[PDB]
Design an enzyme around this catalytic site. Structure first.
Site, mmCIF file in Angstrom:
data_model
loop_
_atom_site.group_PDB
_atom_site.id
_atom_site.type_symbol
_atom_site.label_atom_id
_atom_site.label_comp_id
_atom_site.label_asym_id
_atom_site.label_seq_id
_atom_site.Cartn_x
_atom_site.Cartn_y
_atom_site.Cartn_z
ATOM 1 N N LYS A 148 2.188 -4.470 8.862
ATOM 2 C CA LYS A 148 3.256 -3.487 8.841
ATOM 3 C C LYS A 148 4.567 -4.154 9.217
ATOM 4 O O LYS A 148 4.640 -4.886 10.199
ATOM 5 C CB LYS A 148 2.925 -2.325 9.776
ATOM 6 C CG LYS A 148 1.693 -1.567 9.294
ATOM 7 C CD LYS A 148 1.360 -0.339 10.123
ATOM 8 C CE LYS A 148 0.220 0.420 9.462
ATOM 9 N NZ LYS A 148 -0.141 1.671 10.176
ATOM 10 N N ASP A 152 -1.449 9.969 18.009
ATOM 11 C CA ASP A 152 -1.083 11.009 17.053
ATOM 12 C C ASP A 152 -2.283 11.323 16.166
ATOM 13 O O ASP A 152 -2.696 10.492 15.360
ATOM 14 C CB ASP A 152 0.108 10.538 16.214
ATOM 15 C CG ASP A 152 0.182 11.219 14.864
ATOM 16 O OD1 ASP A 152 -0.080 12.440 14.791
ATOM 17 O OD2 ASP A 152 0.511 10.524 13.878
ATOM 18 N N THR A 196 5.074 2.774 1.659
ATOM 19 C CA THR A 196 6.220 2.624 2.535
ATOM 20 C C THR A 196 6.223 3.717 3.596
ATOM 21 O O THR A 196 6.340 4.902 3.282
ATOM 22 C CB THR A 196 7.542 2.631 1.748
ATOM 23 O OG1 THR A 196 7.566 1.507 0.860
ATOM 24 C CG2 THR A 196 8.725 2.542 2.701
ATOM 25 N N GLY A 197 6.070 3.309 4.852
ATOM 26 C CA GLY A 197 6.110 4.226 5.970
ATOM 27 C C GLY A 197 7.535 4.501 6.406
ATOM 28 O O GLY A 197 8.490 4.051 5.769
ATOM 29 N N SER A 198 7.677 5.239 7.498
ATOM 30 C CA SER A 198 8.994 5.629 7.988
ATOM 31 C C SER A 198 9.802 4.437 8.489
ATOM 32 O O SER A 198 11.034 4.476 8.498
ATOM 33 C CB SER A 198 8.861 6.675 9.099
ATOM 34 O OG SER A 198 8.205 7.838 8.626
ATOM 35 N N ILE A 224 0.839 -1.191 0.000
ATOM 36 C CA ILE A 224 0.000 0.000 0.000
ATOM 37 C C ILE A 224 0.877 1.244 0.000
ATOM 38 O O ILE A 224 0.660 2.186 -0.772
ATOM 39 C CB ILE A 224 -0.941 0.017 1.227
ATOM 40 C CG1 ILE A 224 -1.981 -1.100 1.111
ATOM 41 C CG2 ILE A 224 -1.634 1.373 1.362
ATOM 42 C CD1 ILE A 224 -2.749 -1.362 2.406
HETATM 43 N N1 LIG Z 1 -4.892 0.149 8.448
HETATM 44 C C1 LIG Z 1 -4.577 0.693 7.247
HETATM 45 N N2 LIG Z 1 -5.395 0.549 6.182
HETATM 46 C C2 LIG Z 1 -5.092 1.084 4.986
HETATM 47 N N3 LIG Z 1 -3.986 1.812 4.743
HETATM 48 C C3 LIG Z 1 -3.087 2.035 5.730
HETATM 49 C C4 LIG Z 1 -3.337 1.476 7.065
HETATM 50 N N4 LIG Z 1 -2.303 1.855 7.845
HETATM 51 C C5 LIG Z 1 -1.454 2.575 7.068
HETATM 52 N N5 LIG Z 1 -1.930 2.690 5.811
HETATM 53 C C6 LIG Z 1 -1.274 3.372 4.676
HETATM 54 O O1 LIG Z 1 -0.027 2.701 4.448
HETATM 55 C C7 LIG Z 1 0.996 3.648 4.115
HETATM 56 C C8 LIG Z 1 2.128 3.580 5.139
HETATM 57 O O2 LIG Z 1 1.656 4.115 6.383
HETATM 58 P P1 LIG Z 1 2.136 3.555 7.814
HETATM 59 O O3 LIG Z 1 2.428 2.080 7.628
HETATM 60 O O4 LIG Z 1 1.110 3.976 8.827
HETATM 61 O O5 LIG Z 1 3.568 4.211 8.192
HETATM 62 P P2 LIG Z 1 3.920 5.700 8.716
HETATM 63 O O6 LIG Z 1 3.197 5.859 10.020
HETATM 64 O O7 LIG Z 1 5.413 5.627 8.909
HETATM 65 O O8 LIG Z 1 3.453 6.666 7.660
HETATM 66 C C9 LIG Z 1 0.326 5.009 4.097
HETATM 67 O O9 LIG Z 1 -0.082 5.274 2.753
HETATM 68 C C10 LIG Z 1 -0.918 4.820 4.945
HETATM 69 O O10 LIG Z 1 -1.980 5.683 4.535
HETATM 70 MG MG LIG Z 2 1.319 4.988 10.801
#
Ligand SMILES: Nc1ncnc2c1ncn2[C@@H]1O[C@H](COP(=O)(O)OP(=O)(O)O)[C@@H](O)[C@H]1O
Ligand SMILES: [Mg+2]
EC number: 2.7.11.1
Length: 267
Positions: A35, A133, A14-16, A12
């Site tokens: 994740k 947050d 890449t997060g931090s 979906i």
């Molecule tokens: N439960 C979820 N359902 C759908 N999309 C998600 C969910 N959690 C995170 N995302 C999406 O996945 C991507 C990575 O976000 P995330 O994994 O939360 O890392 P970070 O907090 O480092 O941004 C983002 O595009 C976010 O919108």
């Molecule tokens: Mg997040």
């Protein structure tokens, strides 16, 4: 609790701290996400903190908090996968960006849904108190008009210098800026989020921290757009009061005549 119990469909984003991937649970075909967390460089003490924090995540069960499902260890690649509810509507930061690009303000009804459902998420967080947050990028929508507060981020409770630094703290309350627990600070942050949903910009903007803090301390901001009711403007403005004790409590928010059954979750 085995990787083979799920099939990755695609990434979906890449997060931090790792990828968020859409996955399909083999037993029943349920669509979820997981994740990725690389724990390979962590000390035993750090991993112990991670364990305690995952367990706290598991304890938070609420219709307006993104649901925890499972944890998977891939020892071979020192990867921890945290399985959670998939939110098909994505995050609110994307919703705001969409509004800006398509030059379309969001419905007051939508703003009321977010206010109602996030206030309830906060109520549960306060009961349990827990890092949270409220930035738009951490608030999610499912496919049924439900709003869910996203996970704080296990590694985040634990790159953290990068965005703690670079990022501009748009939603930080006046009192937290002087010195970091205060549940009324969450109400200020909620006010900022709701304001941004209406205005498509945060109430206090700046190019530097110093400038931002100056604006926050003054407590002045434009009215949300006139398409929004005086009643909605009133409550958001109350949440942005300089005095924590003038901001409405969770209970006071939910008593507002604006908030009706249909603004709550329906699953
Ligand atoms: N439960 C979820 N359902 C759908 N999309 C998600 C969910 N959690 C995170 N995302 C999406 O996945 C991507 C990575 O976000 P995330 O994994 O939360 O890392 P970070 O907090 O480092 O941004 C983002 O595009 C976010 O919108
Ligand atoms: Mg997040």
């Amino acid at each position: 609790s085995r990787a083979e119990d799920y099939e990755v469909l695609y990434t979906i984003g890449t997060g931090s701290y790792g990828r968020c991937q859409k996955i399909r649970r083999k037993s029943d075909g349920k669509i979820l996400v997981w994740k990725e967390l690389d724990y390979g460089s962590m000390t035993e003490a750090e991993k112990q903190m991670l364990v305690s924090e995952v367990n706290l995540l598991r304890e938070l069960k609420h219709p307006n908090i993104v649901r925890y499902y499972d944890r998977i260890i891939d020892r071979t690649n020192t990867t921890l996968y945290i399985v959670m509810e998939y939110c098909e509507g994505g995050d609110l930061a994307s919703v705001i960006t969409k509004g800006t690009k398509e030059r379309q303000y969001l419905d007051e009804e939508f703003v009321l849904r977010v206010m109602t459902q996030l206030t309830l998420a906060l109520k549960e967080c306060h009961r349990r108190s827990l890092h949270r947050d409220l930035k738009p990028a951490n608030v999610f929508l499912d496919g049924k008009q439900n709003v869910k507060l996203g996970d704080f981020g296990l590694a985040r409770i634990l790159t953290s210098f990068a965005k703690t630094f670079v990022g501009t703290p748009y939603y930080m309350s006046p009192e937290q800026m002087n010195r970091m627990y205060n549940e009324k600070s969450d109400i200020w942050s909620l006010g900022c989020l709701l304001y941004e949903l209406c205005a498509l910009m945060p109430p206090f903007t700046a190019f530097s921290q110093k400038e931002l803090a100056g604006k926050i301390r003054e407590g002045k901001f434009r009215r949300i757009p006139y398409r929004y009711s005086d009643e909605l403007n009133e409550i958001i403005t109350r949440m942005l009061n300089l005095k924590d004790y003038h901001r409405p409590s969770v209970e006071e928010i939910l008593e507002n005549p604006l908030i009706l059954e249909h603004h709550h979750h329906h699953h």
